[PDB]
Design a binder for this molecule. Structure first.
Ligand SMILES: COc1ncnc(OC)c1C(=O)Nc1nc(C(F)(F)F)c(-c2ccnc(C(C)(C)C#N)c2)s1
Lengths: 424, 150, 71
């Protein structure tokens, strides 16, 4: 509980941990749980104590009589090569609250970008991934892409059972099941709003098709909005590979961080300059003789001017043409300045930490997806996957383990401890 | 390409100009291999080439997906005109053309596209132009912060 | 930009706070009266402003304090 971080403590608490642990030599201390139902390992997992965690997960005790207390046994070393045999007793998500499911599902610590790089956690995520999660995730991407192309074709070929029944029933069933899935996912408590938006798009599709079946011709709006939103939601599934991961997540960073506040201030610009210009206008005796007519007209022209399609004509039937021209030049200049300010905000600030934030968000979303798929599978298939092996380390321990080969040329040591004398 | 074009010119197939002009363009592009010899030209040519291959291509893919989705959306929002040319977003390819011109800044924003829900159509169009603007900004950061180091 | 923005904002906030400080009457200002009382000397009882802190680096046998019983 009191272990904070090396920069503020010099990490004596890890030393005292080792001392007190191997002094009372047994699993008495690590096995008890507190009134929150957590063990010291699970506890350091619940909080964000990375140092204590990195110690407990990979703790090697090389003394003979206390070797059974370790959670990493170099069992195979021959030279600069070696095969550390980590432990997966309460880390492998096969318990109520594992260290891994805690480290991934605890979003109120804000340090996981480091904790999910620890000794067995990182490679266990990697192994679960390459075993089943890559396959299930790519399958989900393919199903969603086909559902999206079917929404697109249904939208294009709206009525101005070949095209109607097949596609409409398929989108109905897919949308209803994914909506129930996302909704029950909401009921658990830029990280996980994709549940919100997926559920919203699915309900949009289902409402659109139900209204199409019903006596309401206002279904096309819902349908086309659902299509544009599903194509937006493809952003979730383009988190996968390194290029698309970085691309999608920095697009998200732009969209949410900066362009939104830029849009807010620009809409304030629009409101103010629109009311000003429409207040400067004079009614034409040929009212269409000046495009800045009603308020909404002026706002439209100002929009087009920002994008570069409006027209600058000094004869807007003004009463003070110089002042009106001044206000209009002011608006275009200031929105130009807001464009420049946005450019600097996204070209100087994020560019430093974009590489790191992209990677940490990629990693956290991969952890969440892997652990979610892990639940989506039945007990028998999960036991059929069962990352890790068996390994004898004590008189009779035979606790699960996870081999990790390694190579280190720096620290040469006469090997003294191993499980197998002969390297396999 | 050049040899096939000139052979077809000699042959009895007068659809050769396509091959010939495309070959001239491809050669003027292959001038890159020779303008990556001199030092200033080496740096210039190869940072152009790294832009082209690294980033504008993925930008083009995602922007093509933008175009396709927004084109089918807009063309599914349109209503037939009884003066069918009374709305530029007519057939699909027409809508894609206008959306391209909007991205380069040549299209026309007229709210009266013979829509049935003009507010929603205008919303989708503003969404497309804003999102392709955002893709331009994202591309700009990807080529102005990352590559500039190495 | 990151540093200049914060320094100019901090200057502005200080100016606004001290501004408002004067905009209020004497009675209300005395009703605010940041700080508390505290006895340090034989009879000092000057104003003071508590600040809790946490430092794990420098361990020292504490020798000086006003209230031996920590509250
Ligand atoms: C890759 O995306 C696509 N691929 C192919 N076709 C497409 O459109 C048909 C699309 C697409 O962008 N769809 C969209 N729908 C909507 C909505 F109106 F629901 F909000 C979009 C929207 C609107 C406003 N602010 C955002 C932010 C900035 C938060 C983001 N992000 C997103 S975007």
């Amino acid at each position: 509980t009191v272990a904070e971080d090396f920069k503020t403590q010099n990490d004596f608490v890890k030393r005292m941990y080792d001392m007190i642990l191997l002094r009372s030599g047994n699993w008495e201390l690590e096995t008890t749980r507190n009134n929150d139902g957590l063990t010291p390992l699970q506890l350091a997992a619940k909080m964000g104590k990375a140092e204590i965690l990195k110690y407990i997960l990979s703790r090697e005790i090389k003394e003979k009589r206390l070797r059974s207390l370790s959670r990493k046994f170099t069992d195979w070393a021959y030279g600069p090569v070696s095969s550390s045999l980590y432990d997966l007793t309460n880390v492998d998500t096969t318990t109520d609250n594992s260290v891994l499911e805690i480290t991934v599902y605890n979003t109120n610590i804000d340090n996981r970008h480091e904790m999910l790089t620890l000794e067995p956690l990182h490679t266990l995520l990697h192994m679960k991934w390459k075993k089943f999660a890559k396959h299930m995730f790519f399958l989900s991407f393919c199903f969603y892409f086909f559902y999206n192309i079917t929404l697109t074709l249904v939208s294009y070929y709206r009525p101005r059972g070949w095209l109607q029944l097949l596609g409409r029933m398929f989108v109905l069933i897919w949308a209803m099941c994914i909506s129930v899935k996302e909704g029950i996912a909401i009921f658990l408590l830029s990280d996980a709003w994709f549940h919100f938006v997926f559920f919203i798009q699915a309900v949009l599709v289902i409402l659109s098709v139900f209204l199409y079946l019903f006596a309401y011709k206002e279904y096309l709006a819902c349908l086309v909005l659902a299509m544009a939103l599903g194509w937006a939601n493809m952003l979730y599934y383009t988190r996968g590979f390194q290029s698309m991961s970085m691309y999608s997540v920095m697009i998200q960073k732009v969209i949410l961080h900066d362009v939104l506040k830029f849009l807010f201030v620009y809409i304030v610009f629009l409101l103010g300059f629109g009311v000003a210009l429409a207040s400067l206008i004079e009614k034409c005796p040929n009212k269409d003789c000046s495009s800045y007519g009603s308020f909404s007209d002026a706002v439209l022209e100002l929009f087009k001017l920002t994008i570069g399609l409006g027209d600058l004509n000094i004869q807007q039937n003004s009463k003070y043409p110089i002042l009106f021209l001044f206000l209009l030049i002011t608006y275009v200049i200031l929105t130009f300045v807001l464009l420049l300010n946005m450019l600097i905000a996204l070209m100087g600030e994020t560019v430093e930490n974009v590489s790191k934030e992209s990677e940490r968000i990629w990693r956290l979303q991969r952890a969440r997806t892997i652990l979610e798929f892990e639940k989506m599978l039945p007990e028998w298939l999960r036991s059929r996957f069962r990352m890790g092996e068996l390994c004898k380390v004590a008189e009779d321990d035979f606790r699960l383990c996870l081999r990790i080969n390694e190579v280190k040329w720096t620290e040469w040591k006469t090997h003294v401890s191993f499980l197998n004398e002969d390297p396999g």
